[PDB]
């Protein structure tokens, strides 16, 4: 049912991590990468 | 408010034509198009080939929740039809 | 020369290991959300288990 | 009809998550 | 293009846009 | 669920009515030497 | 058409009987 609109909104089915954030923070996890990373709190589907 | 009239139609005939018959819902759906008024097929044709796609995919999941869905007048596409 | 008839039994042993049974549909990992769990979406019915 | 299908490839998010070109074969002791 | 990352000389150091995390226990 | 129960013949249409009517005509006419008859199903209905 | 197989009782074919029929369960 349109991806179960909660699956969504959990992360559990859809858009990847360095999607649904806001190009500009993933820009930013991206460049202070080496010190004080960002990448282990957002989750991004892995759907089969 | 166009479109929905025909929507009515194609519950019911896809519905009548599996109680007279029973066959196979792409059978259904054929004989479904094939009486429709010229001027209101012609209108809406490209509603009408979405409209047969999401209701025989929507049988193929699950035909219990599909004769509800036809025996449900008050039934509306849901979101995701659209998109 | 003096050996005496025998019987071979065997076993293996195992540990830390903690038997899975993927609910994918060949075993296989090929995502998180299985093949299976989309299906069972899909359905959108109810079934017990024994 | 004449619709043209791709192929479905995993996916790892909206992305199918194709991968590289991996097609290598080379072994050769030496 | 917040570059306030280490540098290489010039040309700030990496980073790939694809990076952010997932796993279980599958 | 209708549509299933006629494709399989729980019920619907006996073997005199579905089966094709060429193939009917076979079956009564050599039914005294090659029978057909317990091939096909037929619906009984309450 | 198919008359031609089925035995002769006479100047008629031996045919009828609609009973290609199967209803067999414990019930």
């Given at each position: 049912?349109?991806?179960?609109?909660?699956?969504?909104?959990?992360?559990?089915?859809?858009?990847?991590?360095?999607?649904?954030?806001?190009?500009?923070?993933?820009?930013?996890?991206?460049?202070?990468?080496?010190?004080?990373?960002?990448?282990?709190?957002?989750?991004?589907?892995?759907?089969? | 408010?166009?479109?929905?009239?025909?929507?009515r139609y194609v519950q019911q005939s896809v519905g009548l034509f599996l109680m007279q018959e029973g066959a196979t819902p792409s059978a259904?759906?054929?004989?479904?198009?094939?009486?429709?008024?010229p001027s209101m097929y012609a209108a809406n044709r490209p509603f009408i080939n979405k409209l047969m796609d999401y209701l025989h995919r929507?049988?193929?999941?699950?035909?219990?929740?599909?004769?509800?869905?036809?025996?449900?007048?008050?039934?509306?596409?849901?979101?995701?039809?659209?998109? | 020369?003096?050996?005496?008839?025998?019987?071979?039994?065997?076993?293996?042993?195992?540990?830390?290991?903690?038997?899975?049974?993927?609910?994918?549909?060949?075993?296989?990992?090929?995502?998180?959300?299985?093949?299976?769990?989309?299906?069972?979406?899909?359905?959108?019915?109810?079934?017990?288990?024994? | 009809?004449?619709?043209?299908?791709?192929?479905?490839?995993?996916?790892?998010?909206?992305?199918?998550?194709?991968?590289?070109?991996?097609?290598?074969?080379?072994?050769?002791?030496?």
């Amino acid at each position: 049912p349109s991806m179960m609109p909660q699956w969504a909104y959990m992360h559990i089915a859809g858009q990847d991590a360095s999607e649904y954030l806001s190009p500009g923070l993933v820009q930013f996890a991206r460049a202070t990468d080496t010190y004080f990373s960002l990448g282990n709190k957002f989750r991004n589907p892995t759907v089969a | 408010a166009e479109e929905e009239r025909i929507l009515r139609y194609v519950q019911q005939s896809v519905g009548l034509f599996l109680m007279q018959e029973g066959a196979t819902p792409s059978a259904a759906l054929d004989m479904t198009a094939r009486n429709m008024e010229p001027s209101m097929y012609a209108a809406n044709r490209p509603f009408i080939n979405k409209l047969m796609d999401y209701l025989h995919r929507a049988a193929a999941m699950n035909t219990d929740y599909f004769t509800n869905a036809i025996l449900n007048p008050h039934w509306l596409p849901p979101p995701g039809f659209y998109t | 020369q003096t050996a005496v008839p025998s019987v071979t039994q065997k076993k293996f042993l195992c540990d830390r290991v903690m038997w899975r049974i993927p609910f994918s549909s060949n075993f296989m990992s090929m995502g998180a959300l299985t093949d299976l769990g989309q299906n069972m979406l899909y359905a959108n019915s109810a079934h017990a288990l024994d | 009809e004449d619709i043209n299908f791709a192929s479905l490839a995993p996916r790892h998010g909206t992305r199918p998550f194709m991968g590289t070109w991996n097609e290598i074969g080379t072994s050769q002791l030496n």
